[PDB]
Amino acid sequence: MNTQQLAKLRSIVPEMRRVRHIHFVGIGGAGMGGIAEVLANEGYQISGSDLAPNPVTQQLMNLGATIYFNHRPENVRDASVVVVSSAISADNPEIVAAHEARIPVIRRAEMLAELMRFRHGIAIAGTHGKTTTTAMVSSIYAEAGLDPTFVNGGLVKAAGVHARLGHGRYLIAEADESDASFLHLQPMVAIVTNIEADHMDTYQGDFENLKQTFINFLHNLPFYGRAVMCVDDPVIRELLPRVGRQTTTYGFSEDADVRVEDYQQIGPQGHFTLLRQDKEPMRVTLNAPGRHNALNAAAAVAVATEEGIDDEAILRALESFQGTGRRFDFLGEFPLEPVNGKSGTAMLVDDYGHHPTEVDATIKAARAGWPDKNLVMLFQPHRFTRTRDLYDDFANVLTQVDTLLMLEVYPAGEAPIPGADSRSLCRTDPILVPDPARVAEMLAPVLTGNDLILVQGAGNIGKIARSLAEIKLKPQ
Amino acid sequence: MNTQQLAKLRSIVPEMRRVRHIHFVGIGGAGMGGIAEVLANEGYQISGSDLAPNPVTQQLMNLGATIYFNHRPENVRDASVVVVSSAISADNPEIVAAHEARIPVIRRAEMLAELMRFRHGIAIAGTHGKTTTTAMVSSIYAEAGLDPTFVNGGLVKAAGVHARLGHGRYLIAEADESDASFLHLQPMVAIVTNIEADHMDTYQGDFENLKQTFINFLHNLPFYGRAVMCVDDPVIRELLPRVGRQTTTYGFSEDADVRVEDYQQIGPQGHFTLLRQDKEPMRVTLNAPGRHNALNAAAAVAVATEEGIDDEAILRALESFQGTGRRFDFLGEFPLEPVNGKSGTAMLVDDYGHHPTEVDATIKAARAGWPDKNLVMLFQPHRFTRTRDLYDDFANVLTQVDTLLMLEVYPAGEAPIPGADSRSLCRTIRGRGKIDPILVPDPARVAEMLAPVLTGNDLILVQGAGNIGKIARSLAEIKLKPQ
Ligand SMILES: [Mg+2]
Ligand SMILES: [Mg+2]
Numbered sequence: 001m002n003t004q005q006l007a008k009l010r011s012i013v014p015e016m017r018r019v020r021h022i023h024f025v026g027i028g029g030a031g032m033g034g035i036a037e038v039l040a041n042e043g044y045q046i047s048g049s050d051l052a053p054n055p056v057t058q059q060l061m062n063l064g065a066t067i068y069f070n071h072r073p074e075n076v077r078d079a080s081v082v083v084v085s086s087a088i089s090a091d092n093p094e095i096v097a098a099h100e101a102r103i104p105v106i107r108r109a110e111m112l113a114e115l116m117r118f119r120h121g122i123a124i125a126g127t128h129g130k131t132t133t134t135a136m137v138s139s140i141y142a143e144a145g146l147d148p149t150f151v152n153g154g155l156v157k158a159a160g161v162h163a164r165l166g167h168g169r170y171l172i173a174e175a176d177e178s179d180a181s182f183l184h185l186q187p188m189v190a191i192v193t194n195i196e197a198d199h200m201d202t203y204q205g206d207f208e209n210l211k212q213t214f215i216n217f218l219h220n221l222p223f224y225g226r227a228v229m230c231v232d233d234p235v236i237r238e239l240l241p242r243v244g245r246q247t248t249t250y251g252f253s254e255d256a257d258v259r260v261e262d263y264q265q266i267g268p269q270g271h272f273t274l275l276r277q278d279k280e281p282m283r284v285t286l287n288a289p290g291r292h293n294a295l296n297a298a299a300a301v302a303v304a305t306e307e308g309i310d311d312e313a314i315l316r317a318l319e320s321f322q323g324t325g326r327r328f329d330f331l332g333e334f335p336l337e338p339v340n341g342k343s344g345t346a347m348l349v350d351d352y353g354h355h356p357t358e359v360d361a362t363i364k365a366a367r368a369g370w371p372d373k374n375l376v377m378l379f380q381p382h383r384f385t386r387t388r389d390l391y392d393d394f395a396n397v398l399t400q401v402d403t404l405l406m407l408e409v410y411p412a413g414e415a416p417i418p419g420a421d422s423r424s425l426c427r428t429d430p431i432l433v434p435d436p437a438r439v440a441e442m443l444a445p446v447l448t449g450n451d452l453i454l455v456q457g458a459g460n461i462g463k464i465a466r467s468l469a470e471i472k473l474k475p476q
Numbered sequence: 477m478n479t480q481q482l483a484k485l486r487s488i489v490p491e492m493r494r495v496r497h498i499h500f501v502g503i504g505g506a507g508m509g510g511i512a513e514v515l516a517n518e519g520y521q522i523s524g525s526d527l528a529p530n531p532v533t534q535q536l537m538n539l540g541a542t543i544y545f546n547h548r549p550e551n552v553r554d555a556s557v558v559v560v561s562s563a564i565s566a567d568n569p570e571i572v573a574a575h576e577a578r579i580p581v582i583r584r585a586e587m588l589a590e591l592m593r594f595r596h597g598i599a600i601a602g603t604h605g606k607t608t609t610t611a612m613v614s615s616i617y618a619e620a621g622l623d624p625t626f627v628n629g630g631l632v633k634a635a636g637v638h639a640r641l642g643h644g645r646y647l648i649a650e651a652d653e654s655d656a657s658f659l660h661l662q663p664m665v666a667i668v669t670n671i672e673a674d675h676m677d678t679y680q681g682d683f684e685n686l687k688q689t690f691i692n693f694l695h696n697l698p699f700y701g702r703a704v705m706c707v708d709d710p711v712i713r714e715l716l717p718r719v720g721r722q723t724t725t726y727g728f729s730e731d732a733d734v735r736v737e738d739y740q741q742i743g744p745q746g747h748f749t750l751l752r753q754d755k756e757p758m759r760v761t762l763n764a765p766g767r768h769n770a771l772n773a774a775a776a777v778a779v780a781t782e783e784g785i786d787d788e789a790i791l792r793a794l795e796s797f798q799g800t801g802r803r804f805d806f807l808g809e810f811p812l813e814p815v816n817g818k819s820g821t822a823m824l825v826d827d828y829g830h831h832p833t834e835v836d837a838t839i840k841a842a843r844a845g846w847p848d849k850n851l852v853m854l855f856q857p858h859r860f861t862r863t864r865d866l867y868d869d870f871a872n873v874l875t876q877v878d879t880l881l882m883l884e885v886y887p888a889g890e891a892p893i894p895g896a897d898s899r900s901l902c903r904t905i906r907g908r909g910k911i912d913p914i915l916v917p918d919p920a921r922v923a924e925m926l927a928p929v930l931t932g933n934d935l936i937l938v939q940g941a942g943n944i945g946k947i948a949r950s951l952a953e954i955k956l957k958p959q
Contacts, residue, residue, distance in 0.1 A: 012488060014596070014645070016700045017664075081699055104699040114698060118594055120490065169490075186662075188493075222590060223557060223580045224492045244580075246494075 001165065006043050009167060013118050015042075019080045022111075024048035025094045027067060028056045029085035031176065034151045034163030035111055036060055041165040049075045049094060056162070073097035080104075083111045086179050109181035112151060116171050116186060119149065122303060123185050125175040125217060126193030126230075128358050129296050132288070133193055134174045135324045136300035136317075141170055143317035144309045148172050154352070155325030178202065180213050186220050189306070191228045191299050195235045198355055201385065211239060221245045228302045230295055231256045248306065250298040252291075258302045263291050265368040268330070270294050274301055282311065287321040289328060290365030326352040326462055328365060331469040336447055339440065339473040344449035346473065347373075350465045354382040354458045356393040363400050366452055373452045375402040378439070378464075380457035381409050381425070384417040391420070395428045401454075403446050404430050410459030439464055440475040477517050477641065488645055489594045491518070495556040498587075500524035501570045502561035503543060504533050507650060510627040510639025511559070511587055512536055517641040525551045525570060531631075532638065549573035556580075559587045562655045563889075585657035588627065588649060592661055595625065595647035598779060599661050601693060602669030602706075604834050605772050606650045608764070609669055611800045612776035612793075614648045619793035620785045624648050630828070631801035654678065656689055662696050665782070667704045667775045671711040674831050677861060687715060697721045704778045706771055707732050724782070726774040728767075734778045736770050741844040744806070746770050750777055758787065763797040765804060766841035802828040802945060804841060807952040812932060815923075815956045820932030822956060823849070826948040830858040830941040832869035839876050842935055849935040854922065854947070856883040856940035857901070860893035867896065871904045877937070879929045880905065880913040881922075886943045922947055927958035 001009065022039055024032050027048025033056035040046045046065035050057060057067050068075050073093050076082055082098040082105045098105045124134040131154040138150040139158065148170035150156070151163040175182035175190070178199040195214055203209035218227050225245050229236050232251035240247060250258040263272040272294050274282040286297050297318055304314050323329065329350040336342045349366070353359050359379075366375060379398065381387050387394065387409055398404060406422045426432045433442050443453070455465040477485065500512050503524025509532035516522045522541035526533060533543050544551045547569050552558055558574040558581045565571075574581045592599075600610040607630040614626040615634065624646035626632070627639040651658035651666075654675040671690055679685040694703050703719055705712050708727035716723065726734040735751040746762035748770050762773050773794055780790050799805065805826035812818040825842070829835045835855070842851055855874060857863045863870065863885060874880060882898045902913040916925050926936070938948040 016698075019700050106699055110699070117698075118488075222492070222593070223582050223586065224495050226493075 001041050001043075001167075005167070009042070012169060016114065019044065021045040021047065021078055021080045023076050023079035023082045023094075024085075025071070025075075025082060025088050025092060026050055026085035027060065027065075028052060028054045029087050031108055031112075031151070031153055031162075031174070032083070032085050033057070033060055034153075034161075035083070035108065035115065036065060037063060037161065037163045038115060038149060038151065038165045040065055047075070047079070059161070073100075076101065076103060081106060081111075083108060086181070107181060107184070109176065109184040112173060113184040113186060115149070115151070116173070119171040120169050121185065121187030121189070122170065122172045123175040123182065123187035123190045124173065124193070124299075125177060125182055125190060125214070127177070127196040127198055128355065128361075129193040129292065130174045131324050131352075132293060132327055133191060133296040133299050134172060136297055136321060137191075137303055138172045139317040139321050140300055140304045140309060140314055141168075141172060141307075144304070144307075144313045146170055146309075152324065154327060156322075157324060158322035175217070177210075177213065177217070182217055183213070183220070185217075187225070188222070189226045189228065189303055190218055190221060191303065192218070192236060193230055193296065193299060194233045195239075196355070196357060197389075198386075200389065211235065215239065215242050218243055218245060226306060228299055228306075230299065232295065248302050250302050251295060258298050258305075260291075260294050260298050263294055265289055265291070265365070267369045269369075270297075274298060276301075276305055279305070279311075282315075284315065285319045287319060288323065289369055290361055292361045292365070326350050326465075328362065331465070332472075334473050336449060336451070339475055340444050340447050342447070342449050344451075346376075346447050346451035346453060348453050348455070348465075348469055348473075350455045350462065352458055352462075353456055354386070356390055356397040359456055360397045360400070362454060362456065363397075366454060370452055373450050374448045375454065376443070376446060376451055377401050377404045377454045377456055378407070378433075378443075378461065379404065380407040380459045380461035381422065382458045383412055383414055384409055384420040385414045387425070388417055388420040391425075395425060398425075398430075405442060405446075406430060406432050407436065407457075407459075407461060407464075408432075408434065410457070410461070412459070436460075436464060438475075440468060440471060440473055443468075443473070444475055477519065481643070482519055485518075485643065491520075492590065495520065497521040497523065497554055497556045499552055499555035499558045499570075499574075500561075501547070501551075501558060501568060502526060502564045503536065503541075504528070504530050505563060506561045506584055507588070507627050507629050507638065507652075508559070508561045508584060509533070509536060510637070511584065511591065512541060513539060513637065513639050514591060514625060514627060514641045516541055523551070523555065535637065549576075552577065552579065557582060559584060562652070562657065583655075583657050583660070585652065585660040589660040589662060591625070591627065592647045592649065592663060594645075596645050597647045597649070597661065597663035598665040598667075599649060599651040599658065599663035600667040600669070600775075601651040601653060601658055601690070602667065603653070603672040603674050604831060604837075605669040605768060607800050607828075608769065608803055609667060609772040609775050610648055610650045612772055612797060613667075613779055615793040615797055616776055616780045616785060616790055617644075617646055617648060617783075618642075620780075620789040622646055622785075628800065630803060633798035633800060651693070653686075653689065653693070658693055659689070659696070661693070663701065664698070665702050665704065665779055666694060666697055667779065668694070668712060669706055669772065669775060670709045671715070672831070672833060673865070674862070676865060687711065691715065691718050694719055694721060702779075702782055704775055704782075706775065708771065724778050726778050727771060734774050734781075736774050739767055739770055741765055741767075741841070743845045746773070750774060752777075752781055755781070758791070760791065761795045763795055764799060765845045766837055768837040768841075802826050802948075804838060805948075807948065808955075810956045812930060812956075815958050816927040816930055818930070818932050820934075822852075822930050822934040822936055824936050824938070824948070824951060824956070826938050826945070828941050828945075829939055830862070832866055832873045835870075835939060836873040836876070838937055838939060839873065842937060846935055849933050850879070850931045851877045851937070852879040852881070852926075852929060852934050853877040853937045853939055854881045854883070854916070854926070854944065856944040857885045857898060858941045859888050859890050860885055860896045861890060863901070864893055864896040867901065867904075870901055871908070874901070874913075875905050875908050875910050877911065880911055881916050881925055881929070882913055883916050883919055883940070883944065883947075886940065888942070919943070919947060923951060923954060923956060923958050926951075926956070930956075
């Protein structure tokens with residue numbers, strides 16, 4: 001923001017004393033660039049280092065951040081503070097130089113917590129749906145004219161950014177449990193969408209540790225804080241009594257404080273009713289598919305109602321919600337002519353979902369709203385570390401499609417565990433794909449006339465997804 | 477605050493959603509009344525309970541608070557939240573009633589931490605000297621026109637209150653380690669005056685757990701926060717590398733960032749020089765006696781200059797500093813003619829000091845500012861546990877006065893412990909052969925015992941925490957009249 005706008009912000013949100021320059025080790029890592037963007041527009045000097053340039057680093061350069069594409073001691077020269085992502089190891093030369101220079105070195109969530117200090121924090125937590133729900137909450141608050149600052153793990157499509165500084169007092173942020181780092185956050189209101197077995201390497205195989213961590217998180221709320229929680233989830237339902245804070249539940253369940261019902265999906269949209277205490281029933285048109293996003297919308301409405309945001313504003317925001325990057329992201333509809341040679345249309349939907357539940361929810365959402373269609377899926381499983389523990393669930397879920405293609409397990413490190421391979425899975429109709437450069441060629445002999453291709457998983461399948469959109473499916 | 481004042485404040489410090497009514501179990505003491513007063517002026521509904529009325533409860537009534545003089549389940553009705561002092565047992569009827577009604581119950585520090593949440597918190601922690609230092613810090617900030625809200629453990633004389641709500645974003649508060657509750661606080665700046673063995677029960681008798689607790693407290697500071705710590709304290713000097721936050725040190729030590737030099741005490745006033753980085757030596761006149769108060773002042777100055785407060789304001793505040801209730805508190809100088817016939821006077825000074833170090837500091841201050849007076853002390857030990865643990869130290873410092881009178885131990889909830897009596901201690905002191913202590917078994921017969929030992933040029937120190945406070949005030953109004 002310009003110097004006059006910033007001065008106005010400073011009368012409500014103070015600067016961090018003596019913090020001139022902030023350096024980010026891994027600035028294009030998950031959630032790093034977003035904080036950096038907010039800090040750039042608050043007027044701090046921003047620098048960062050990453051090995052892999054991307055759209056995020058590109059955005060950061062435009063905002064005036066000096067970005068380095070290597071790791072060397074000089075990169076932290078002059079920094080007030082160094083912020084490291086979870087990906088960065090203790091040996092990294094930038095960390096080592098920071099300690100030698102006695103420059104404070106902090107985790108991503110510590111810095112996020114400082115953004116929350118003199119703001120009204122709304123932390124969106126849970127195993128799945130965090131990104132979407134966070135986006136829905138910031139959509140509502142923006143529509144209400146409250147101009148919130150938000151930090152999202154995904155690209156908020158209506159805003160073209162992962163994160164944005166607002167002139168408001170509000171902070172709306174996705175809260176990461178994957179490394180227990182969300183325990184740094186001190187919000188006014190917290191959402192817990194669900195709790196499921198994922199990122200277990202940080203809780204050492206004990207699911208009871210994960211439940212406790214979520215409880216500890218919710219215990220960060222002030223005595224008058226509010227937890228907004230999905231009662232449909234059986235683990236949340238049993239954890240309720242251990243929550244020492246005011247709680248408003250949501251879900252399809254009959255006892256839920258905010259209750260969903262009359263749900264039906266018509267194409268890309270969902271139509272349902274929301275029952276709230278002291279309110280006339282609310283008929284909702286949601287610009288998002290699947291009853292999982294209905295739950296996501298209910299959470300957001302629960303928060304907005306507690307804020308006392310006008311209902312029309314809630315309804316306009318949800319009706320025109322533009323989604324997030326790679327979350328059931330519809331890229332286009334393409335003629336089956338310069339590819340295959342038939343007649344009709346094949347659809348392209350991009351999704352980040354990497355956990356059986358996410359994947360299942362995508363199939364469930366494709367089937368409803370587009371019932372007379374051929375379900376084709378390109379699926380890149382994420383980490384051997386993950387594919388082993390959920391071997392059973394992956395096979396049981398992925399089989400629900402029509403035809404299916406699979407890529408080789410994205411490593412991100414973690415040496416290949418034999419038997420956790422893609423080849424192992426695509427036997428337990430499936431068809432493997434080894435060549436990443438030739439994907440439209442693999443896809444050609446399996447496209448009918450009325451199709452919906454579904455590109456699934458995290459990894460680099462996102463780069464292979466945009467390509468398959470660039471070429472309009474022309475196998476070259 | 478009036479309606480519009482409050483609306484302004486609410487642009488920076490929001491109200492706590494859905495908290496209408498705040499009830500205080502033990503509203504009369506601690507820094508409990510102070511919090512109630514701040515919250516009263518923020519326009520919340522305030523209620524509280526305590527066993528005896530006092531000036532604190534009067535003020536709160538005048539501010540529109542409902543105060544009950546008892547502990548019954550009814551006292552808690554319609555409360556959004558119940559706040560309890562460390563002086564309240566967990567089975568107090570009001571606490572049990574509150575849990576029964578599903579009303580959130582929180583400790584004093586948790587509520588203090590809520591006051592600090594959206595403010596720029598400055599916490600003054602340490603074993604001794606907290607009340608004085610936080611008063612000194614709030615004087616400098618008030619002087620500088622920063623209008624801080626503050627919550628002190630003692631009455632701030634210049635203000636006439638323990639605590640005041642200001643329009644600024646600053647919160648200046650005394651932090652309590654005695655029950656480890658200061659871990660709730662999330663300050664921007666933290667002073668640690670000193671770390672010494674007291675309240676050792678809550679630290680399982682282990683002095684290492686106390687040190688670690690201070691370290692954990694300091695770690696509540698954000699990466700850009702500051703620790704202001706007294707380096708003259710060997711335990712503090714030892715802990716420095718474990719802190720992990722920007723820290724500036726102070727003290728008479730050579731390696732101190734804010735160094736005190738050239739200390740002379742003249743009567744009730746301290747004179748000394750403060751050395752700070754990229755700053756000319758500062759020549760301070762402090763309106764407080766003793767080396768210990770020059771250190772407290774240095775702590776306050778370190779914070780103020782970090783804040784970038786104008787040096788002239790710093791010096792104005794230090795020079796006109798009015799002190800705090802029961803902290804080397806001058807109550808008057810009375811003629812001896814109508815008390816024991818004799819000619820001349822006896823000065824009366826009230827002091828809260830309950831720990832040997834504190835008692836020693838009061839003695840040293842009396843000595844240096846009035847060397848030729850006959851130093852008389854009325855002392856009352858606080859608790860038996862403390863008396864047991866620090867026995868030899870009590871004997872060492874208490875024998876430094878010319879005349880010692882001693883009341884029975886004020887148990888403050890504790891059961892008697894054999895060997896840790898006032899009479900135990902009096903035998904020990906007697907054995908040292910310098911003074912012959914007089915027991916005062918009836919707390920109302922004080923002026924009776926006091927008259928005979930007054931000579932004509934005396935300074936009476938009334939010394940100890942609570943109970944003896946009443947006696948000090950009685951001696952002032954009767955003007956020492958031996959009846
Ligand atoms: Mg995850
Ligand atoms: Mg104490």
